[model samples]
Target chain A: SKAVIVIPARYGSSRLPGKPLLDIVGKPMIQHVYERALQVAGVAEVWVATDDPRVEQAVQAFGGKAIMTRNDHESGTDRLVEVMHKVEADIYINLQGDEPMIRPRDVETLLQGMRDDPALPVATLCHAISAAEAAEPSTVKVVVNTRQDALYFSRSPIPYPRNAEKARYLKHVGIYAYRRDVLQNYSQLPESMPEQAESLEQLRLMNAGINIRTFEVAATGPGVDTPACLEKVRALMAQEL
Target chain B: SKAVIVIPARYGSSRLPGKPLLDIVGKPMIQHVYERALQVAGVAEVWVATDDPRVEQAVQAFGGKAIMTRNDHESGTDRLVEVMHKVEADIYINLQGDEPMIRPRDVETLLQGMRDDPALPVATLCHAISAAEAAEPSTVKVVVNTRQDALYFSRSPIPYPRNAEKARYLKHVGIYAYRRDVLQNYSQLPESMPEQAESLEQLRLMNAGINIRTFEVAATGPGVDTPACLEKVRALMAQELAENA
Candidate 1:
């Protein structure tokens, strides 16, 4: 099965404007993410799907494919759907522009799961976090069943931490791998109750009985969400250089 | 399909001792529950499964059947399993002895669902609860899927009430209708994580991928858990008799 990675690089960021085009260690942030996606084993091609002309220009200037998508896209998945219409692949990996430090192995893990199971509609990543981190509403937590399928995702702590030590909290990673048919039918699924309450798009899939298999990565590097996070990423990138 | 109601009338109560024998409107509390079970349609027999002989004697004294179960049983379901060995019924309704006020219609709704769909392994009840009650851990809350199957049950308020009014919280009713095979094979299933964390036995079935269908009732009457609740039930029962007189 052929897999293609699409990075959604929106120009507007409430915390950091022009985030994708921002320089991090002499390269645009989106380029760093594109480079990492290019390193994944099974991905046939990597493209940046962005609404803004500036982000498109930046990706093309670096000799990477850039597909112009509608600015009105409600979510990154929507942008990937637009890319799906233009590009052909059995699996569409939606890699976030902000996660420049995303490991190629993690991306491959998601791609491999899709290739191994043709019936799997979607797959995502998670990593264990501290109890304190799990409590933070800003950090979304996921609880999985015995089959490694996500049972529930919440902004509030899950398992109620009745036995705090026994509860394992997995922090949700934004990367997602969607089957082509699932993406084609995404718009038809009704908005679900928990989806609206949690303000998470993924719940729509769960509410509709769509299975989302999750793979746990050992650790994830910092994602560039805010100015402070950008500075952290810059320092980390500079050390590697 | 034959249906039998089993009420686990344990002699011990953390808050109120000898709770089964406690007087309510001139009858033992177990008798009131047994009488309510008798009012339900399609039930062949009603039995009180108790570990204590006194509760057994009380049921027999009221012309009702009582079966002695192992005192070492873990939960009400376990006690019901012990009774399942002695009783022959296609469907087993585990009606809590404390819920003397359990509506017959609620039990019937569960039985109807089971009869309507033979494949349904278990059916339970839930009713809409106040946001304040949903927040209380003592009142377990349930979230259901579009098919009316329980997605999850938790001590913490579900849907996180992020959109407070949009999130409908259902308070789980203890009354359950189980298929004969599900009860027979119950002990083999391993205990689940969520079951232990929430101290809810139902999750063990859930974690094992067994579907627990849920039916919504309009409202549920008070259950007698504490002495204060017993007094409340007594007053309610007395009012009914007065109105009839």
Candidate 2:
């Protein structure tokens, strides 16, 4: 099945305002995200779905596809759904605009995880977080049952590890792959309590009993969600070595 | 439907050796339990099931029916199935051998609890334990969901109130009422892990997705498990206060 990657880039970012306009080398941040997404072998096509004309012009200037979606959207998933109406793909990848460092294979892994089961609505990634990350609620956790289906997701340290039997945490990764039907139906879902408390949109899927298939990635590439994260990604990109 | 009460008494008692013959008043201990079973409003008949022939004579002497069962059986529920072949009833109540202070009304309550729910396989009793009992494995604490169906029964206090939720520790009542078919099936099930850990038979039912409705009793009488318990029952009977109980 042909898979499409849609990067949801908008002008307004709560943590880093005008984050897409930020410069990584000479190219805008959206160019770096779009260029990296095109490298994934599984993605048949890459489209930048943004509300800003400037973001659309930047992608077109770099000889990449950009779809200008309506600006009334509230979330990244909703933006993907709007763009999906104009495109055709069995698997829809929600490529976050801010993640310039995300690898092509990490995106490939998300697609491969969902390929085995067509009934699966969404697939994401997580990695074994070090002990330091366990104390930080900023790193959301995903706990899966023996069948590799997620039982719950929480900001609170899960499994409560009452026995301390196993690993402390699996830090949730931002990359998500959605089935075409799920991406459309997700916009109808209302906000959830644990989602509101943790301020993480993924928790709504779990609280509603939808299973999120997650695999451990080598490393969680930094997503440029804040001014501090932008500064860090710039230094990583600038290292001449 | 006429629900039958099956009291699986034995001549051999672990703690108060030969406890069934122990004097509750002028009569033997099984006589006190038998008299209570006779008084339940829903029950048409109460039968004493025992492997020992002497126990049969004791019941015959008291004008109560006695049914012979296998001595090789490991649990009370097993003995109840053995006796089930000869007698007939819509439901069977596994009355514990040790409970001399059990009220007929309590037996009726469990019977009605099963009758009210047609899909119900089994229903038992549970009561709040004191703080001291919650810490004891022998007490067998239970954590129930909002529906009052037992979610988990454990020797280790489960649903571990990590915070100060101040959980209610339910002490499982020994008495059980099973639909005739449920009793036949439950008696043959092998011991399971959760059941083995807690040493509770009900966990076997809960492990297989079977629901056991738990009714909260206001109070529970003591079981005659030890010599100390025998003395306590004698004291209660001498006071003659349990007639009101």
Candidate 3:
């Protein structure tokens, strides 16, 4: 099936302003993310969906496709739904813009998950979490059932580890791949209660009884949410260079 | 469709000895529970399932049906499944013996929920809980999806209430109604991880991808877990007797 990748880049990242345009090495942060998306083999197209003109101009300047979206979008997902109108594909991967270190294989892993299950309206990534990492609210936890469909996602550590170090847990990776029609259904569903409570938009799909097929990736890239992390991303990129 | 009720009564309660045969008012605790099941109009038959001969003999003594099940079963659900083979019915309500105050209408409510969704293999009860009540580990909680199928069952408060009194929570009622075939299916499935973690048997159903339709009862009845609660039940029965007088 044909898959399109949309990196929803909003200029106003509260912690790191103009995050997509923030330079990592010589290229903008979005460019690093865009290059990674381009590396995925089967994707029909790769696009940068952005609200700001500066973000649009940067993607165009770098010779990458950019779709200008509404400024008033309530969320990054809403911005993607707006992009669904312009970009025609079987699936749309909502790859995060700040993920400068994202590997191409990880993107392929998400696309493959969608291809494997046609009934799956959405799919995402999760990797095992450390005991130390589990306690941090920033690192969301997910508990899956026998079929690996997520039972629940929470800021609080799930399955509660009630058995004292017996059960393994998965830390949710923010990367999401949605079928094009699921994005159409997304626009119609109201904001979900768990979504609002945890401040995670993915819960809205789970709330709507949509099963998200989860695949474990080799690794989840660190996201640059703040200046310190942005500097860390730069240092890591220089090491690669 | 003919529905049957099987109240799984175990005599060796860790808190109160021989709880099913204990006197509540004029009859044994099992009798009170049995009478409630008999009140439900659609039930074709009701039987007491117990490992102890005393529990079986007591029910029979009171003119109620009793099925002797094996003592080696791992869980109450397992005991009910053993009875499932002997009992002939379309739906089996695995009623709890400890739940003396359970209303027959609530039992009917669960039956009605199954009737509404014939595809629902298992169904149970839950009611809104106060935040104070939600903290008790003994009172298991369940969070359901928009379709009302259980998302998860936990001893810890679920949906975690991060928004501060914004989200309403439900405490799981132990009463369960299973399709006769589902009982056969359950025996084939192994114990689940979430089921082991929280020590909740209901999670086994959710873990198996079996949807448990939740029907909210008017109020969940308190179970006699200890001598203190048994005394409380006796006091409540006395109050009812005095009120009628």
Candidate 4:
């Protein structure tokens, strides 16, 4: 039942280096993400895993937990595993620092999926997409197996019904919950064939035969990757009371 | 263990009317199909189900069993169902009257699939196809489930492992073997959406929750439909030896 939410903030983001330090309105991006994690009812605590002293100092300035992780992590998944050693929790939530506007409820939903399935070591979130976004390759589509296990994730539309009922596409959200032990092994697991080709990190766990319980939530919080995306998310967040 | 082969020979054919009586190698087409069924070790008897008295007379003259079915029967399956009612067997083989050169051993392989899975009501056969036939949409593909149960049948090449598993296509053989109860229900079952869309009758059973178990046999046996198909089969049969014979 213990959950530690770790926001993997890095200084060397390709498009937006020092992304966690980027200002959203007036507050630092990492502060907004950490504050959102603090709102989740299922989460026991929230911490920032960062390599840059500026990212650690900013979290410390806000009176939040900060764990200094190695900068050599190839993915946010790798960064979270290293931070897990510094933190004490049963489940560690991999909170993407780039997704500054993600809701706390979405994080809780991901945690609940792992709680419900003891056999599953990890869980993630997805939301139903509108028909307009369904055709877009940028929208990572996920199809759930009968047991809420991810069958496959693809840019191309799956469940291409030639005959009968058509299936709606699920938009994969960028948040994950991993049992502490699973996250430890996730760091050591080598890159898989499907994982490399798709460049989707979650699929690496799948290619390793890891059962990732999927949580389907109603809302998918916007992720701010670029400067324009930051402005768009801020605009979208302002509409909510 | 008992099996009866029913060759549904309707008097009115869409392309060639009075088809069953067509002389193939100096024998009626229906007779050749019936004789072929008798050669299979497990098949106790074979019958021709027809609506017309002429087909009925033709079979009786050849010293074969011909059951007079309902004139109002809509499909060949419906006629076969009526014939099955009057006969006694655990399994009913739907032998198309048109396939005059059907091999008995190929029919046995289809029956083996049914015997292997007692829970499965229907079973069919297909052959390992060459590289050329695999790409042909006209060659209906069978997308096998993990257990080798047919998950879906399509014109499109399936199991399209995004990783691309190396192989040619599986050619779905038209031959089918049905448990008696499955045959009766299949005839009475309502048409389904998959069947209507694909214009493939076999899919109706699948769409309606029927599990059709299928297996691959080593059949290169030709099924005659059109004149070209008939000529092709005739030539193939002419060169047959005891092994491929």
Candidate 5:
């Protein structure tokens, strides 16, 4: 089965405005994300799905594929759906534009998972978080059952740590892999309380009784969400030289 | 299917000693629970599973059946399993003896649920609780999925009321109905973390991938746990007769 990666790079970011167009070291942030996805061995192709023409021009300038999508997309998944109309593939990987440091194999893990588990319609990744991250609402946590399917996702610490029994917190990342049909129909699923209360879009899938197969990556490359995070990623990129 | 209600009336309660034999009004406390189970139309018989001879003698004096089991059994479910070997029934309802005011039809609802869905091996009941009660650790809460199957049960307030969505808290009632097979296999399922951390027996079923069908009642009759709850029931019982007069 063929797999493709779609990087949803919007111009307006609430934390860091025009985040995709921002310069990391030499290339625009979205270009760095595009190049990372290009390295993945599992994916047949990679496209930068953006609402702005500037983002499209930047990707084209770097000789990479870019698809112009609607500006009103509610989420990154929605942007991927718009790309689906033009792109043909068996599986779609929604890689975040901010996660420039994400390894190619990390993307390959999810693509390979889709092949291994044909019954699994959707999948994602999480990394073990520290106590400080667990306490921080910014780092969303997920609790999984025996099958590694998500039971619940909460901003609040789960398993509640009421007793002395120690359990590690799995911090949710922005990357997601979806079967072609599952990605297309996700918007039609009804709104759910757990999703609304937590403001986490992934919960909508779990709420609708859709099992999201979770894979734990050893460590996640930092995503450039805020201006502060962008500077940190720039330093990491500079040091590698 | 033939159904039987098993009331596990332990003689020694940590908070209230000899709680089963304690007088609730004119009758011993266990007698009130026995009579309540008798009101349920679905059950063919009700039995008091106790380790104490006094409790057994009291049940017989009131013309109610009593089965004496070994005192060393860990939980009420264990004691009921011992009775299951002696008494043959298709269905077993573990009705707590402390809940003297359990409505008979409430018991019927579960028995009827089993009839409605033959695949449902185990079932229980929960009632809506206030935010204040949800905050209390003693009040165990349940969060159910879209299918009305329990997602999880905890001592901590679930849904964490994170946003202003205003979801209702389902307070767990102690009553549980089990198909004969589920009860027999219950002991074999290993202990789980959620069950151990919360110190709740029901999590073992959930952790083992067993779905617990839950029925939400409009209201649940109070259960007598601590001495404070016993006094509250006493007042409610007294007021009922005064109104009839």
Candidate 6:
């Protein structure tokens, strides 16, 4: 089965504008993310799905695939749905454009998870984090059943830590793998109360009874959401170079 | 298919000793609960499964069925399982002896829910409660999926109330209806992490992949856990009798 990675690089950012095209070391941030997606062994092609023409031009300049998408998408998932319409693949991996530090192996792990369970409509990643970090609403928390399928995802601390020492928190990684058929029916799934309350798009899938298998990875590097975060990544990447 | 209601009337209580045999009006608390169980339609028999001989004597005094169960059993569900071994019924409804105020109609609702979905191995009840009531650790909260199957139950408030008003909290009613097969396999299921954390036995079944369908009722009257709760129920029952008289 062919797997395609779609990097939804929306031009607008609340903290840092032109985020996808922002320079990381020498290449644009999206290019760094795009290059990493291309490194995943099982992925057939990696395309930059962008609403802005500048993002599209940047990907094309780097000799990478770029597909222009509608600017009206409410979420990166909606952008992936548009890309799914234009592109053809059995699996669509939504690799966020901002995660320049994403490890190719982590993406491979997600793809492998989907392959391991063909019935899974969606798959994503999570990594163990300290209870302190999980307490932050900005960091989404996930709990899984015995089968590793997500039971619930919340902005609030879950399993409520009644026995604080027994509680394990897994921070959700934004990247996702969606089956072709699942993506086709995404728009029609009704909005769910918990999804709206948590303001998480993934909960919509869960509320619709679609199981998302979560694969534990060591860590997914910091996403460049703000100028401070971008500088942090820049310093880290500079050390790597 | 036979349905039998088993009220696990444990004689020992941390707050109130001889809680089951404690007199509410003219009858014992266990008798009040047993008689209510008798009112529920479709139930073949109602039995008091108790650990103490005194509780057995009390139930027998009322001419109701009483089965001796091992006191060493940890949970009410364990007592129900022992009763299941001795008794033959397709469905076992575990009605706590403390819930003397339990509506017969609510038990009927749970039995009907199981009938509506034959694949369901277990079914339970919940009722909408105020956020304030749900915040109490003593009050178990439940969140359900679109199918009304429980997603999770916790002592801590669930759905986290990011949009506080939008959050609907359902307080878990301890009453449960278990299929005979589910009760038979109950001992084999491993204890789950969440179950140990929250001290809720229901999670063990969930962790083992059994779905517990939750039926929402208008209300389940207060359970008598403490002496104060007993007095409150006593007052309410007194009022009910006055209205009837």
On TM-score, the leading prediction is 6
Interface RMSD (one decimal) of model 6:
1.7
Model 4 C-alpha lDDT per residue in residues A1-241, reported as the tens digit of each score = 7988888888886687888888777788888888888898977888888899988898899898888888778878878777777788998888888787787777767777778777778888888886567556677766564456665565544434344343456888878888888977865777654444445667666556566667898866678777788788778766764
Candidate 2 lDDT, B1-245, residue by residue in tens: 76888888889765566768778778898998998888888887899999999889998999999998889998777788777777888888888766888977878788888888888888889888765676666676654544466545655443233332444467888788888887668766655444544456676675555677788887777777877877887888777765665
lDDT for every model? Answer: 0.87, 0.75, 0.85, 0.73, 0.82, 0.87
> In terms of docking quality, how is candidate 2 classified?
incorrect
Q: What is the two-chain DockQ of model 5?
A: 0.43
lDDT of 3 at A64: 99
- Model 6 residue runs over 4 Å out of place are none
Worst 10 residues of 2 chain A by lDDT: A158-167
TM-score of chain B of each: 0.98, 0.93, 0.96, 0.87, 0.95, 0.98
Which scores greater on lDDT, model 4 or model 6? 6
Recovered share of real interface contacts in candidate 4? 0.02
Better of 4 and 5 by TM-score: 5
In the range A9-30, model 1's lDDT, one tens digit per residue, is: 9999898889999999899999
Task: For each of the candidates, give the backbone clash count.
Answer: 0, 0, 0, 0, 0, 0
Model 4, C-alpha of A96: deviation from truth (Å)? 12
* lDDT of candidate 6 at residue B1, scale 0 to 100: 80
> Candidate 6 on A63-107: residue-level lDDT in tens?
999888889998989889888888999999998889899999999
Best by lDDT: 6
In model 2, the clashing pairs are none
Error of 3 at A140 (Å): 1.6
Interface alpha-carbon RMSD, every candidate: 1.7, 8.4, 1.8, 7.2, 2.5, 1.7
Task: Considering chain A alone, report the TM-score of candidate 4 relative to the true chain A.
Answer: 0.92
lDDT of 1 by residue, B32-103 (tens): 899999999999999989999989998999899988988888878988888999899999999888877878
Q: What is candidate 2's TM-score against the reference?
A: 0.57
After superposing candidate 5 on the true structure, give the runs of residues whose Cα lies further than 4 Å from its correct spot.
B70-72, B75-81, B243-245
Q: How do the residues B1-245 of candidate 4 rate in per-residue lDDT, one tens digit apiece?
A: 88888888876878777888877667788888888888987788988888899999999998999889889876677776777778989998887888777778888887776777778788887767654665556777664433456655655443333444443356787777888888767756777544554456776676566767778777566666688877776666655533464
